[PDB]
Design a protein around this nucleic acid. Sequence first.
DNA 1: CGCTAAGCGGTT
DNA 2: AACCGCTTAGCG
Length: 62
Amino acid sequence: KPRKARTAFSDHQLNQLERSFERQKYLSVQDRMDLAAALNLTDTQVKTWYQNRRTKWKRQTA
DNA sequence: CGCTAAGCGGTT
DNA sequence: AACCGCTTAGCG
């Protein structure tokens, strides 16, 4: 039953996440931890964004 | 509605 | 542990 609050990413955060995705389709644990730290996000928020972004990427190229 | 963050069951 | 492939649900 108990759900996490949906994260609202700042324009800055979305911009940097998208920049990271265009450089690298996947992150090492350490690059993920560095990006989360740089954008004041949690490791898991950045991991979930990567994964949602990969799904999107497969739809829009397929 | 459309986009997408988070949840679920199963893959590797 | 992280990913996949899909689903659920929040909000503009």
